[PDB]
Design a protein around this ligand. Structure first.
Ligand SMILES: *[C@@H]1O[C@H](CO)[C@@H](O[C@@H]2O[C@H](CO)[C@@H](O)[C@H](O)[C@H]2NC(C)=O)[C@H](O)[C@H]1NC(C)=O
Ligand SMILES: *[C@@H]1O[C@H](CO)[C@@H](O)[C@H](O)[C@H]1NC(C)=O
Ligand SMILES: *[C@@H]1O[C@H](CO)[C@@H](O)[C@H](O)[C@H]1NC(C)=O
Ligand SMILES: *[C@@H]1O[C@H](CO)[C@@H](O)[C@H](O)[C@H]1NC(C)=O
Lengths: 48, 20, 63, 88
């Protein structure tokens, strides 16, 4: 039980730095937003 | 929440990031 | 024998009256293509007549 | 000039419609308009007396109707989407 607790806990910690120093971990969510904005802009410009 | 960045609107989601 | 030099980044001019902010705006307008060679002159013992072509840059360096 | 009242306007031939307001942002003395990412003419430098105005859309926003079924009541509430409560 005790060992496993740590292996859990440490594995928790790494996740943070797998994030905090890396934005590209969110690539999916990051794209969904872009493609949206990427539409409207392309849509807006069509006014010109 | 850090890692993320003419009639056009944005409707607020029903749920909100307090509820979510 | 006019001896060139490398135009580097010079020659960018506000094409219009429009303020903008923090924005990348793309424009097609007569410019000085970067890193071209610039014909280069002096005052020494140096002002011929040069064609206007499209339109012409110019400069100097002075005391 | 009129500020904080939706107006058509023209400046030096620039024509647009909005809510003219004072703004802090500073120009370069030869620059005239503002713009934005979307090429939406935004700031304007007041030609007679130099100052940085703004523009702003008017309001727009939709009207929506929140009702229990007419089978129940004819009493309805109306949601004006995204406007400060002034105009209405
Ligand atoms: C089973 O594996 C785990 C890790 O895969 C071992 O735990 C590490 O053991 C070393 C020494 O053997 C320690 O220095 C590490 O600190 C331990 N890890 C943690 C997170 O505390 C464990 O010893 C292994 N057990 C056997 C019997 O091989
Ligand atoms: C610039 O000058 C150098 C040396 O005279 C020459 O090698 C080069 O081709 C020239 N390029 C242009 C665009 O004049
Ligand atoms: C809908 O209307 C009918 C007749 O007017 C009524 O019998 C029924 O109860 C109504 N529905 C509800 C949910 O009240
Ligand atoms: C509504 O307008 C008033 C004008 O006095 C302003 O103080 C307030 O912040 C505005 N509120 C919203 C939600 O727009």
């Amino acid at each position: 039980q005790k060992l496993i607790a740590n292996q859990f806990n440490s594995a928790i910690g790494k996740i943070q730095d797998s994030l905090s120093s890396t934005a590209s971990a969110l690539g999916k969510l990051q794209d969904v937003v872009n493609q949206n904005a990427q539409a409207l802009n392309t849509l807006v410009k069509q006014l010109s | 929440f850090n890692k993320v960045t003419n009639g056009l609107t944005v409707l607020p989601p029903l749920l909100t990031d307090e509820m979510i | 024998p006019p001896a060139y030099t490398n135009s580097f980044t010079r020659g960018v001019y506000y094409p219009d009256k429009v303020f903008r902010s923090s924005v990348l705006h793309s424009t097609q307008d007569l410019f000085l293509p970067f890193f071209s060679n610039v014909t280069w002159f002096h005052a020494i013992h140096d002002n011929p007549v040069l064609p206007f072509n499209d339109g012409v840059y110019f400069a100097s360096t002075e005391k | 000039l009129v500020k904080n009242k939706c107006v058509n306007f023209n400046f030096n031939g620039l024509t647009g419609t909005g809510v003219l307001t004072e703004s802090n942002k500073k120009f370069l003395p030869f620059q005239q308009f503002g713009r934005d990412i979307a090429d939406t003419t935004d700031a304007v430098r007041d030609p007679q007396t130099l100052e940085i105005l703004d523009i702003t859309p008017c309001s727009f926003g939709g009207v929506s109707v929140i009702t229990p079924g007419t089978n129940t009541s004819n009493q309805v509430a109306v949601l004006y989407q995204d406007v400060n409560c002034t105009e209405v």
